Amino acid sequence: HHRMRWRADGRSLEKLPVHMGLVITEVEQEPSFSDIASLVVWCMAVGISYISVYDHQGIFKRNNSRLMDEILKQQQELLVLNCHLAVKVLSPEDGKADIVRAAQDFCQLVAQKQKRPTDLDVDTLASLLSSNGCPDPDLVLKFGPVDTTLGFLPWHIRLTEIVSLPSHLNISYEDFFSALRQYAACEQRLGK
Amino acid sequence: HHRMRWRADGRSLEKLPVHMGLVITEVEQEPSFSDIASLVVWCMAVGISYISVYDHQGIFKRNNSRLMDEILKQQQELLVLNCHLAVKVLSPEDGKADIVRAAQDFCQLVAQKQKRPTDLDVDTLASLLSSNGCPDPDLVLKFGPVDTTLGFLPWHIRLTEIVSLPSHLNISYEDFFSALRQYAACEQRLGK
Amino acid sequence: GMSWIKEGELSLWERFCANIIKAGPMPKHIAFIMDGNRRYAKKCQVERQEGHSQGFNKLAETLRWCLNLGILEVTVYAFSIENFKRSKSEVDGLMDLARQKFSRLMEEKEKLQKHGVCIRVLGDLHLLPLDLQELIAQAVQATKNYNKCFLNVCFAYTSRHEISNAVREMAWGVEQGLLDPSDISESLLDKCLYTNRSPHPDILIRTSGEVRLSDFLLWQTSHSCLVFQPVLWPEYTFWNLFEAILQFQMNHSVLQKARDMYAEERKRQQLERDQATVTEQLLREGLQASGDAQLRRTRLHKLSARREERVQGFLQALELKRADWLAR
Amino acid sequence: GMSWIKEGELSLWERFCANIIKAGPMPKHIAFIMDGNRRYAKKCQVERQEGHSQGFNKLAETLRWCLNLGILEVTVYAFSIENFKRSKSEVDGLMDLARQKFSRLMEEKEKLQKHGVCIRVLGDLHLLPLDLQELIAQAVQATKNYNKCFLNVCFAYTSRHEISNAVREMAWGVEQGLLDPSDISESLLDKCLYTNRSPHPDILIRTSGEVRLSDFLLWQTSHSCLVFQPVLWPEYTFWNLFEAILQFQMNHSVLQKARDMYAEERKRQQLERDQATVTEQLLREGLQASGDAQLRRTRLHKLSARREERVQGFLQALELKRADWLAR
Ligand SMILES: CC(C)=CCC/C(C)=C\CC/C(C)=C/CSP(=O)(O)OP(=O)(O)O
């Protein structure tokens, strides 16, 4: 029913992000897990394959289950490993600190005479940069008054389109879907 | 030569401490390792079997080798395991903290059903209070203006005679030996 | 015949000198090892019992001096377990003298309620004559709930015995599941001695001129100002006490610095030891030492909160077992 | 034909509005992704090269505005490795245009010594025409030791390549024994990028209205104020820059709070990770986790001092290898 309508909405857009990024810069109060979860299931319904939740304080990483529970609530009411895969809760160390980790690993394989420094190719580091089973984000929704990525996966946002909304509190589908139209009309020339 | 004279000096005293305690309360400047070592060898020559060095900051425990080196210097010039046995450098945790350790051990043997709380006799705890191969001190020399033991082996000073000298800096044999005469004349009635 | 305190006001010079020292740091708690009673009897050519009897008169005299100086908590060494090895005459005489005053204290009740005198007798009292224990308990029970001042009589006491009993109380709590061996701490031990209700003495005064603690408050008087005065106890004067308070004020700056540093160091040492225990548990069970989960930080806050739970619960049972003295 | 900077003074309103914002927090370093040159040529119905040529004129115009506002360090995105995939005409045209200005900058030397302009071209310059690299190096070599202001031209640059090279430099230091893998830190990585001499930009301005960083200073602009303005770069106005500085001042309070917290958190995380490494070594080899030897505390101070030794020594060789550019 309503599942098909949301699937049709996403299908009509000229483009849909395969990986979605939800960056909350708001820190005046604790984030709204309901509004967050409500965005997440929306992404799943329109057809976004992966959704990453990020905050600078790490509040989400702390209260992971509180979100995943809220997700499953909305995920059933008016809508397991099914969301734990696509939904990944992130924190600042998932970016620069993880890039440091990758260097520490390659510096070690170099030191083991197994790899050569001359083999630290960009594509090589990318694979070593915890690619896991996630592609690079292509659409980030920056919720808040601060105009910054606050350190969200700096290696991966190289070509990500960054759309900003004034707050996530009491967010609405039309607000969330109007952002998706914007990305759909965005033009990537890839330097050509 | 001079070794016999110092041995005769100690032999003439009505009593000699088997275990000597050197408590430095002075904290205006770093202690004088030479003056300390000079006292130690004096104790060894007059015939004191054990000598314990103590300070509240733990400076001696930190710079142990600097003292033991200084000791060996005086110990040969004008005088191995030989001093490491009799000379023990102490710190605050050698007292109350060690008493806590002993409780933690007996509480464990009680919890192991191997011992009963009703068996925590005074004599039992004493053996458990790191008796090692040292008797209880009988003469403490308190060097400094502060009039306190500053937490020197509280369990063991139960009947120790506490003599005070104004400073250990530039100490003299006559000053050190006059303290030994005082202890020699001290009367222990043992509550009778 | 004589009660436990006197009503004598301070003299002009005594009150003037008092007002002077009172401008500086005053001791909250002074401890007395009342030594020299027997030697004083010999010089005065009087029977030993009379020396001890005078000793009590002085204890009442000195207590009023303390109250006049604002020193509200006083601990005294009255009978040592060691003193049980003296002649029967003297030992029985000391017991008799105790029975007389403890009985008169109850006869002079209400006067104790007048000045909020909380009499607390501390020691291994199970070694005393049954009659004397009931008098003690009777006294202690009535003067409880009184808080205007505090006197701790150490009858049949040795610090080693007090420390060992306190250890037993902690092993008992382990035996009953109230404690784990890891919980046994210096603070926890503090709350298990007889002086659990009394702060650590500021000054330790021994008379007679002996320079030994004779197994008295060894744990408590670690950072206490040790005052050794040659005067024989039954000849103690206000000025003797004055001089002792002077010696305290001289060293109070450095004494208090050393106390705070010991405390600050002790806390740091535990926090390091605790963080290591949390690290050893987090290093095992896979996991990650840090990260943003703040897992070590959260685990630490719980370990402390659960630490107090077992300890604070244990303390409630110890006090209930303690207050279970219907022996009055 | 045109040098790298202009001498135009500020206008009345521009100088008045400037004095106003200058009362608040000003950015120390602004970064520019000069986008829209080609789109601007189409609307103006002019050849693509002329659009890029105007783009340079604006870069000189905007740089003077920055100097007039006190903003002394400016980093700009001039050529991306990706742009090598455009038509030969356009790519050759951009190289030519670079060769012209870099040559004129040397012809207009001394004027560069006049204003202490330190030109620093940052990128994977080994991909450029050999002629252009020598001109770049020649320019960079002369403007070094100049400190009155700083301009960083990002020619043939991508942030991923800069990060990967910086990783290579750290693995190189491991290969030569200058580094251990454990030393590789976020700070250490910072000192290995091309921008090692430049502080992290306060503002990141991209024109044209694209809301993407196109592989530019990803590491550096993590906590930077991201300003995306619709204006096409060759039409950039002082007020455009003004508005960008406004957006910075709005968020500066919360931006700086987040920056300090990230830094304070990062330090705490390492200190916890280091204390665990010291604990794991002290838990092994017998020993005692704490005690009064302060052994963990002393071992920690050494690990840090030895940490810097290898790192600070490594950095000296990296800079020597860097300064080994007699290619001028
Ligand atoms: C609490 C109460 C009601 C009564 C007890 C307090 C009184 C009056 C006397 C204390 C008895 C003792 C053992 C005093 C030690 S002095 P000593 O025997 O060591 O004399 P010496 O040092 O040998 O000269």
Ligand SMILES: CC(C)=CCC/C(C)=C\CC/C(C)=C/CSP(=O)(O)OP(=O)(O)O
């Ligand atoms: C440093 C120096 C002397 C010269 C280089 C600086 C100049 C003059 C131009 C930069 C060249 C490029 C690639 C600009 C990107 S705009 P675009 O090509 O993306 O235009 P578009 O976004 O497609 O409308």
Ligand SMILES: C=C(C)CCOP(=O)(O)OP(=O)(O)O
């Ligand atoms: C020199 C510059 C400014 C290269 C980045 O701009 P692009 O125009 O190449 O970025 P895209 O819009 O093509 O992704």
Ligand SMILES: C=C(C)CCOP(=O)(O)OP(=O)(O)O
């Ligand atoms: C009640 C008291 C004051 C017992 C301790 O005094 P002691 O007289 O028994 O101490 P010693 O001098 O005998 O060692």
Ligand SMILES: [Mg+2]
């Ligand atoms: Mg005596």
Ligand SMILES: [Mg+2]
């Ligand atoms: Mg473009």
